[PDB]
Design a protein around this ligand. Structure first.
Ligand SMILES: O=C(O)[C@H]1O[C@H](O[C@@H]2[C@H](O)[C@@H](O)[C@@H](O[C@@H]3[C@H](O)[C@@H](O)[C@@H](O)O[C@@H]3C(=O)O)O[C@@H]2C(=O)O)[C@H](O)[C@@H](O)[C@H]1O
Ligand code: CA
Length: 320
C-alpha cells in the first residue's frame, strides 16, 4: 500500500531543502530561530545579516521553519555539530506544539488571531510540515541520525496521523463529488476560509498539489486512495483546467492568461460550487475577468499556473 517517493513533489521539496543554501550559512539560519523553536518569517539567508533570535511567533508561511529545519538537519548530518541537532529538535517540538486537537496546523504559533489561526495549506505550509514530520517519524534522511529518539518518532507519527485525518475531513465535497482543498480551512470547523483580502474561500489550484503529494507519501488505505484519486481526477478534468492556454507572469501588466497550443492552465482559485476559476483584489471582491483587477494585484500575485502538471504526471507514474 506504499507508493514510491521518487517523483513525489513533497519529497522533492524536502530533499532540495536539505541543500537550499551553502553550509557556511548554517549559523545565520540558526541565528534567526525564535525561542519557541520556529522561525519568525521567510528569509533570504543569502542576503541578510545575522539575527538575534527572539520571542516572536514562529511561522510556516513561505517555507519558514520547515525549510530551515530540513536544512539544519542535513548540516547536522554532514558536520556533526550538536547546536544544529538542538535547533532541529526545537523546530519539530514547535511544529507538534502548534497542532490543534483536530490535526490542523496554524500559520503562526503562538496564535496571533485572524486568518493565521486557520489550518494553513497556503505555501504548502501544512502539507510540507506534515511531510517533514513524516520523514522524521520514519527515520528518512536527513533524519536518520541521533537527532530524534524512538519516543520523538511516536510523537511525530501521532502528529502525521492527526494531520492526515484533518486533510481527509477537510477535503471538499462539490455537490456530492470529492474534490480538493482551500488554501485555508477552519481549524475546528473544517470549512474553507478567507486569508488576505484577495484570498477568498475556494478550491486552491495551487496548494492542493502539495496536499495530494503528502497523502501519496502515506500508506494508501481505501479512503486515502479514494481521496487521492478524486483529487487527481479534479486536477485532470476539462471542467477544471483551461485548454490551449498558459499563465505567463511576464504578461501580467494587462493579461497573464494567454492562448498556448499544447498547454493547460489551472486557476489559483476555483469556485467551491461551480468550479469556475475566479479573481479577487484588495477590496475582497470576486470577479471573472482578470483585466478588471488592480494592476498591483495582477502583477503582485499569481492568479494561475501549471499547477496540475506535476501531480498528474506523478499519478500516472504510480498507476493512479
Ligand atoms: O502568488 C503568490 O503567492 C505571490 O507571493 C508573493 O507575494 C505575496 C503578495 O502578493 C505580496 O503583495 C506580499 O504581501 C505583503 C506581505 O509581504 C505579507 O507578509 C502579507 O502580510 O501580505 C502583504 C500584502 O498583502 O501585500 O507578499 C506576499 C507573500 O509573500 O505571500 C510573491 O512575492 C509573488 O510574486 C507571488 O509569488
Ligand atoms: Ca505566498
Amino acid at each position: 500500500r506504499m507508493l514510491t517517493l521518487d517523483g513525489n513533489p513533497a519529497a522533492n521539496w524536502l530533499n532540495n531543502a536539505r541543500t537550499k543554501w551553502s553550509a557556511s550559512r548554517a549559523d545565520v539560519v540558526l541565528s534567526y530561530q525564535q525561542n519557541n523553536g520556529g522561525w519568525p518569517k521567510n528569509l533570504d539567508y543569502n542576503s541578510v545579516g545575522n539575527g538575534g533570535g527572539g520571542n516572536e511567533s514562529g511561522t510556516i508561511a513561505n517555507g519558514a521553519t520547515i525549510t530551515e529545519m530540513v536544512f539544519l538537519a542535513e548540516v547536522y548530518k554532514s558536520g556533526g555539530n550538536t547546536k544544529y541537532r538542538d535547533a532541529v529538535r526545537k523546530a519539530a517540538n514547535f511544529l507538534v506544539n502548534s497542532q490543534y486537537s483536530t490535526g490542523a496546523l496554524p500559520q503562526f504559533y503562538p496564535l496571533k488571531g485572524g486568518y493565521s489561526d486557520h489550518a494553513t495549506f497556503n505555501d504548502n505550509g501544512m502539507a510540507y510540515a506534515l511531510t517533514v514530520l513524516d520523514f522524521a517519524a520514519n527515520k528518512r534522511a536527513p533524519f536518520d541520525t541521533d537527532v530524534f529518539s524512538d519516543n520523538d518518532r511516536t510523537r511525530f507519527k501521532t502528529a502525521v496521523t492527526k494531520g492526515t485525518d484533518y486533510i481527509l475531513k477537510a477535503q471538499w465535497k462539490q455537490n456530492g463529488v470529492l474534490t480538493v482543498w482551500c488554501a485555508q480551512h477552519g481549524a475546528l470547523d473544517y470549512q474553507p476560509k478567507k486569508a488576505r483580502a484577495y484570498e477568498l474561500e475556494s478550491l486552491s489550484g495551487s496548494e492542493s498539489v502539495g496536499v495530494l503529494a503528502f497523502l501519496m507519501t502515506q500508506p494508501q488505505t481505501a479512503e486515502i486512495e479514494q481521496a487521492v484519486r478524486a483529487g487527481v481526477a479534479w486536477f485532470n478534468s476539462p471542467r477544471t483546467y483551461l485548454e490551449g492556454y498558459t499563465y505567463d507572469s511576464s504578461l501580467a501588466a494587462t493579461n497573464p492568461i494567454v492562448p498556448r497550443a499544447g498547454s493547460k492552465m489551472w486557476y489559483r482559485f476555483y469556485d467551491l460550487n461551480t468550479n469556475r476559476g475566479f479573481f479577487s483584489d484588495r477590496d475582497g471582491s470576486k470577479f471573472y475577468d482578470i483585466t478588471q483587477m488592480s494592476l498591483e494585484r495582477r502583477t503582485g500575485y499569481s492568479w494561475g499556473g501549471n499547477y496540475g502538471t506535476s501531480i498528474i504526471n506523478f499519478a500516472q507514474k504510480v498507476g493512479y
